[PDB]
Amino acid sequence: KMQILVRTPFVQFITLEVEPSDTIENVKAKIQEKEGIPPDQQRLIFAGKQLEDGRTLSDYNIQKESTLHLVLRL
Amino acid sequence: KMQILVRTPFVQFITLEVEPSDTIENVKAKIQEKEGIPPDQQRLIFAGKQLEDGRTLSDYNIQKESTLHLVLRLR
């Protein structure tokens, strides 16, 4: 009869299957396919560095189960 | 070739279809069905009150599109 919302404290992770040769831009494209956030609204942070679109995951020592941080850019 | 995880700042809401006569116990059961969180691990908080299992949504004047807060209750 009525809709209510329950705000949860749960943290969302985007889980992606990637190759070490994938560029940061390719990862942003995958995030866009999953979430509809354009690449230019995405900052990907790893180990205190904003990752550059043209570099690869392997360049940054990103390994299996590494956690990146997505921060939106308005 | 490998799994990676991208942590996001996005807030998750559980959307429930409920009746004013539903008890808080009924609401917690619905959350369990959707998310596998047992009722004893759920605190539901609204308007500065922890909602009691035996009382109804109507008892709390919870209306359409009210945003309850789920706070996990663990030992």
Author numbering:
A (entry chain B): 0 to 73
B (entry chain A): 0 to 74
Could you share sentences copied from the article?
We explored this idea using the model virus Turnip Yellow Mosaic Virus (TYMV), which encodes a vDUB known as PRO that suppresses Ub-dependent antiviral responses and is vital to virus replication as a protease that processes the viral polyprotein. The tightest binding UbV (UbV3) was chosen for further study and was found to block both polyprotein cleavage and DUB activity of PRO in vitro. X-ray structures of UbV3 in isolation and bound to PRO reveal that the inhibitor exists as a dimer that binds two copies of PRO. UbV3 blocked polyprotein cleavage activity that is essential for TYMV replication, and also, DUB activity that usurps cellular Ub-dependent antiviral mechanisms.
